[PDB]
Amino acid sequence: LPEIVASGDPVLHEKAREVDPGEIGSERIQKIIDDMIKVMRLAPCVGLAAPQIGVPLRIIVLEDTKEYISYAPKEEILAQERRHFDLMVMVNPVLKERSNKKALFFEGCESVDGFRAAVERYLEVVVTGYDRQGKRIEVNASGWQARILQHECDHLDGNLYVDKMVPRTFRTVDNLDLPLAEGCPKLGS
Amino acid sequence: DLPEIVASGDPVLHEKAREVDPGEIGSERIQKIIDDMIKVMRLAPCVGLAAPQIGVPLRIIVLEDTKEYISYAPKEEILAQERRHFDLMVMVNPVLKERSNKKALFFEGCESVDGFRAAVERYLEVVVTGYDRQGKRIEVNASGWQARILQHECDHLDGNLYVDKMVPRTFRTVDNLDLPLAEGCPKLGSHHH
Numbered sequence: 001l002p003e004i005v006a007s008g009d010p011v012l013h014e015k016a017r018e019v020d021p022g023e024i025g026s027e028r029i030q031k032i033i034d035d036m037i038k039v040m041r042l043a044p045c046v047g048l049a050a051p052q053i054g055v056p057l058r059i060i061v062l063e064d065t066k067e068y069i070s071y072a073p074k075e076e077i078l079a080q081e082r083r084h085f086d087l088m089v090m091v092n093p094v095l096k097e098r099s100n101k102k103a104l105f106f107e108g109c110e111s112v113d114g115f116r117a118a119v120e121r122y123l124e125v126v127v128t129g130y131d132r133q134g135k136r137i138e139v140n141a142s143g144w145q146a147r148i149l150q151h152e153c154d155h156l157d158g159n160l161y162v163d164k165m166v167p168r169t170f171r172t173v174d175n176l177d178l179p180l181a182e183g184c185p186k187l188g189s
Numbered sequence: 190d191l192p193e194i195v196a197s198g199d200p201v202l203h204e205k206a207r208e209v210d211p212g213e214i215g216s217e218r219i220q221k222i223i224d225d226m227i228k229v230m231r232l233a234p235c236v237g238l239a240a241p242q243i244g245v246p247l248r249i250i251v252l253e254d255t256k257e258y259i260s261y262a263p264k265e266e267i268l269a270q271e272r273r274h275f276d277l278m279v280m281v282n283p284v285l286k287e288r289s290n291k292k293a294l295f296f297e298g299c300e301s302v303d304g305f306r307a308a309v310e311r312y313l314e315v316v317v318t319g320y321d322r323q324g325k326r327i328e329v330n331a332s333g334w335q336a337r338i339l340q341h342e343c344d345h346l347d348g349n350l351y352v353d354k355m356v357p358r359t360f361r362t363v364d365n366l367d368l369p370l371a372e373g374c375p376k377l378g379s380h381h382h
């Protein structure tokens with residue numbers, strides 16, 4: 001299995017190429033997709049973009065399970081509208097917002113280990129693309145799944161969350177629960 | 190007991206530090222805080238520190254770049270960075286202003302953000318007014334790397350870390366430090382001067 005690439009490797013900071021839709025069902029593409037799923041599950045995390053395994057192509061994978069969700073208190077889960085959703089694989093995804101509604105919550109990236117910051121994201125998204133077998137799909141999501149989708153689509157444009165985080169909120173994981181500083185906007189919606 | 194360095198997320202690092210009363214500077218209380226800063230800076234080792242970094246909400250900075258630290262970096266980088274040695278310096282209530290429009294872009298790390306670096310745009314030439322550790326009124330004119338350290342430390346005093354003013358797409362792990370800058374990132378270096 002490929003290792004998860006860390007901030008600084010130019011593949012993370014460069015625009016990824018679209019995959020020919022007619023090649024999505026090939027061996028090479030199908031292995032990359034399978035690798036992504038194994039790596040996401042081994043971390044574990046709720047999403048992965050192909051550049052994070054060294055692949056300059058427009059492919060994301062993502063899932064959130066009852067198990068992952070059981071690590072967080074019910075209060076957090078509620079505020080975050082965080083809900084289980086099946087393994088999704090999107091090739092050449094194009095995200096657009098469904099409205100102008102945003103929420104502000106703490107995010108971490110497997111390519112930036114030991115840190116988090118508060119990031120503003122649209123609550124409601126639609127993402128068009130192809131699935132794992134090359135079939136055109138449209139995905140509408142709200143809450144936490146929406147957030148994950150923007151996180152992962154970001155990676156495909158060479159964008160990490162550190163370059164769009166709320167100022168003064170960046171922090172170690174051990175400092176996650178400390179208050180927000182004077183002037184930071186409150187968390188939530 | 191020596192203070193530990195405070196890490197990103199602790200509010201003292203993200204909020205504006207208060208002035209030292211100039212009449213208080215020569216007191217044992219403030220002198221101990223200064224001595225603690227110098228010792229924490231040296232232990233690290235690093236080239237500067239701000240009081241919020243040892244959990245003290247005061248406008249105090251220390252800095253030091255010795256011939257021995259400098260002796261480790263490549264000769265080429267020292268030239269480009271205009272990185273010159275300078276004796277230990279303490280400033281209480283520092284007030285920083287640029288002396289021109291000339292800037293430079295190089296990599297920085299912060300003791301408060303362990304394990305990462307990023308490209309940060311700084312002024313080449315600055316003047317800093319304040320008080321020395323005896324509470325005497327001073328002015329320091331700095332350029333090059335020393336001007337850079339002064340800017341990073343003064344920023345800490347207003348609740349500002351480099352991560353919130355870094356060139357997009359350059360944040361990296363220390364281990365990935367020397368990997369190529371991505372397409373569209375400005376090159377490292379400075380304005381002619």
Ligand SMILES: CCCCC[C@H](CC(=O)NO)C(=O)N[C@H](C(=O)N1CCC[C@H]1CO)C(C)C
Pocket residue numbers: 044045046047048049052068071107108109110111147148151152155
């Ligand atoms: C919300 C935005 C989605 C971020 C997705 C990231 C993974 C990533 O870097 N994707 O590109 C993640 O899983 N981060 C982790 C995460 O969110 N996890 C780990 C497993 C379950 C879930 C919540 O704890 C850690 C680093 C916090």
Ligand SMILES: CCCCC[C@H](CC(=O)NO)C(=O)N[C@H](C(=O)N1CCC[C@H]1CO)C(C)C
Pocket residue numbers: 234235236237238239242258296297298299300301337338341342345
């Ligand atoms: C360049 C702008 C000023 C840097 C000041 C920082 C320390 C800090 O966070 N001060 O508030 C530092 O010393 N950082 C270290 C540093 O610059 N060092 C450590 C020892 C010598 C010198 C060059 O390697 C590391 C993180 C690189």
Ligand SMILES: [Zn+2]
Pocket residue numbers: 108109110111151155
């Ligand atoms: Zn990520």
Ligand SMILES: [Zn+2]
Pocket residue numbers: 298299300301341345
């Ligand atoms: Zn610092």
